[PDB]
C-alpha cells in the first residue's frame, strides 16, 4: 500500500500555504488549489486548479461572504469530486473568517470524507485586529469544518504574535504557521516511505485520526544530554495550536534516532507524552533507527480524542 496524499488549499490563505509548500519542495503529494478568485488562482503554483463559482462571482472572490463560498463550491461540486479522485488522505487547508475558505472548505472536506479519504483540516482563525465579524464568521467556519472532517487542527493567528519580535516580517511569521501543515504532510510521507523498527503505517494513522475532532500535531528535535525528554516536550508544546495535549485519548508517537537510541530514553519520551494525556489513552508507539544519524533524535506526536 502506498497512500495517495492530496493537499487542498481553499481560498486565499489556504492557497498561500499551498504555494509556499510547493516552493519548499514536496514530492509524492498532489496539490490542489481551489478559489473563487480567478486572478489569484491563475498565479497559483499547483498543477490542479479549480475555479469555483464562476457563475455566481463572475471570477471574483467571495467578498468575505461565506454564503458565496459555500454556494460556489456547490456550483462546482463535480469538478471538486474529479480533483479528489483516488485520494487516501486529504489535507484541507484554509483561513477561516473570509468568504471562500469559510464557506467552501467544509464542502470540500465533506466531498473528500465521502470518497473515503482520511480528511484532515488545517485552518487558521483570524487575528483579533481583524475584528468581531471576522472572528464570528471564522467560528462558524470552524464548527462547519469540525462536522465535515475526520480531524481538525486550528491555528489561531493571534498565536503568531507570541513568536515574533517587533521587527519580524509578516511573511516570516506566516511561514511559521505554514510549517504546521508542512510538517504534518512530510510526517505522513515519511511514515509511508520508511520501515520502522517498530513500524507504523497508514492504518495506524487512520485509527488515531478517523472520526475524531480536534487534534494536536507536533515535532521536536534535539541532541546531546536529555535529548529524549527535550524532543518530547517540544513535540507536545504546540504554541501555535488551539488544542493542547491535556486529556488526549489517542496518540500516535514516533521516535526516530540513530543506532544510539536507547530503551531508557524511549521510555522517558513516552512517559512525558503519557503523563500529559488521558488515563485511557490508546497510544500507538513507533520507532525508526536511521544509521545515518549520529546524536539527533526526532519525536513526532499526533494527539486526538478530547
Per CB under 5 A, which of residues 189..208 are in contact with Ca ion? 191, 196, 199
Structure-block grid coordinates of residue 286: 513507533
Q: What is the DSSP track for 241-265?
A: -S--STT-SEEEEEEEE-TT--HHH
Q: Give which of 252, 259, 264, 255 is closest to 293, Cα–Cα.
A: 259
Nearer to Ca ion, 152 or 191 (CB): 191
Q: Toward ligand ZI7, which CB reaches closer, 169 or 291? A: 291
- Determine phi and psi for 57, rounding to 5 degrees: -105, -10
Does residue 252 belong to the site contacting ligand ZI7 (CB under 6 A)? yes
Residue 16 contact, options Ca ion, ligand GDP, ligand ZI7, none, Cβ 5-8 Å cut-off depending on partner type:
ligand GDP
Candidates 288, 29, 73; CA nearest to 184 is 29
Residue 62 interacting with ligand GDP (CB under 6 A): yes
Cβ closer to ligand ZI7: 54 or 190? 190
Cα gap 254→139, rounded to integer Å: 32
Build a one-symbol-per-residue string for 195-234: x at contacts with ligand ZI7 by CB under 6 A, - elsewhere: -x-xxx----x-----------x-----------------
Q: How far is the CB of 58 from ligand ZI7 (least distance, A)?
A: 37
User: Does 12 help bind ligand GDP (rule: CB under 6 A)?
Assistant: yes
Scanning 42-50, 93-101, 202-210, 260-268 for contacts with ligand GDP by CB under 6 A, the matching segment is: 93-101
146-165 binders of ligand GDP (CB under 6 A): 157
Q: Is the distance from CB of 260 to CB of 225 less than 8 angstroms?
A: no
Q: In what order do the strands lie in the sheet with 48-51?
A: 48-51, 29-35, 5-10, 89-95, 118-125, 151-156
Question: Under the phi-then-psi rule, with left for phi > 0, alpha for psi from -120 to 50, and beta for the rest, what region is 75?
Answer: alpha
d(CA 222, CA 167): 28
Chosen from ligand ZI7, Ca ion, ligand GDP, none, partner binding at 217 (C-beta under 5 to 8 Å by type)? ligand ZI7
59 labelled ligand-binding: no
User: How many other C-beta atoms lie within 10 A of the C-beta of residue 282?
Assistant: 15
Q: How far is the CB of 220 from ligand ZI7 (least distance, A)?
A: 12
Per the annotation, binding residues for GTP are 12-16, 99-101, 130, 134, 178
Per CB under 6 A, residues contacting ligand GDP are 11-13, 16, 61-62, 64, 95, 97-101, 124, 126-127, 130, 134, 157, 174, 177
Amino acid at each position: 500500500h502506498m497512500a495517495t496524499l492530496k493537499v487542498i488549499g481553499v481560498g486565499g490563505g489556504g492557497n498561500n500555504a499551498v504555494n509556499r509548500m510547493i516552493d519548499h519542495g514536496m514530492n509524492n503529494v498532489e496539490f490542489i488549489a481551489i478559489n473563487t478568485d480567478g486572478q489569484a488562482l491563475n498565479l497559483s503554483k499547483a498543477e490542479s486548479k479549480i475555479q469555483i463559482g464562476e457563475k455566481l462571482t463572475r471570477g471574483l472572490g467571495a467578498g468575505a461572504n461565506p454564503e458565496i463560498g459555500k454556494k460556489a463550491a456547490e456550483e462546482s461540486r463535480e469538478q471538486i469530486e474529479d480533483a479528489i479522485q483516488g485520494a487516501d488522505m486529504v489535507f484541507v487547508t484554509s483561513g477561516m473568517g473570509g468568504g471562500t475558505g469559510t464557506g467552501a472548505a467544509p464542502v470540500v472536506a465533506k466531498i473528500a470524507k465521502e470518497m473515503g479519504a482520511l480528511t484532515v483540516g488545517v485552518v487558521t482563525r483570524p487575528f483579533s485586529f481583524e475584528g468581531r465579524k471576522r472572528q464570528t464568521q471564522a467560528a462558524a467556519g470552524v464548527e462547519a469544518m469540525k462536522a465535515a472532517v475526520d480531524t481538525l487542527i486550528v491555528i489561531p493567528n493571534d498565536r503568531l504574535l507570541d513568536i515574533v519580535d517587533k521587527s519580524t516580517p509578516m511573511m516570516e511569521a506566516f511561514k511559521e504557521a505554514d510549517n504546521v501543515l508542512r510538517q504534518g504532510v512530510q510526517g505522513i510521507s515519511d511514515l509511508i516511505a520508511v520501515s520502522g523498527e517498530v513500524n507504523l503505517d497508514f492504518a495506524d494513522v487512520k485509527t488515531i485520526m478517523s472520526n475524531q475532532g480536534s487534534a494536536l500535531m507536533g515535532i521536536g528535535v534535539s541532541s546531546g544530554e536529555n535529548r529524549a525528554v527535550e524532543a518530547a516536550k517540544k513535540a507536545i508544546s504546540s504554541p501555535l495550536l488551539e488544542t493542547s495535549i491535556v486529556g488526549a485519548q489517542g496518540v500516535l508517537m514516533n521516535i526516530t534516532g540513530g543506532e544510539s537510541l536507547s530503551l531508557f530514553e524511549a521510555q522517558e519520551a513516552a512517559d512525558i507524552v503519557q503523563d500529559a494525556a488521558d488515563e485511557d489513552v490508546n497510544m500507538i508507539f513507533g520507532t525508526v533507527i536511521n544509521p545515518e544519524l549520529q546524536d539527533e533524535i526526532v519525536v513526532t506526536v499526533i494527539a486526538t480524542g478530547f
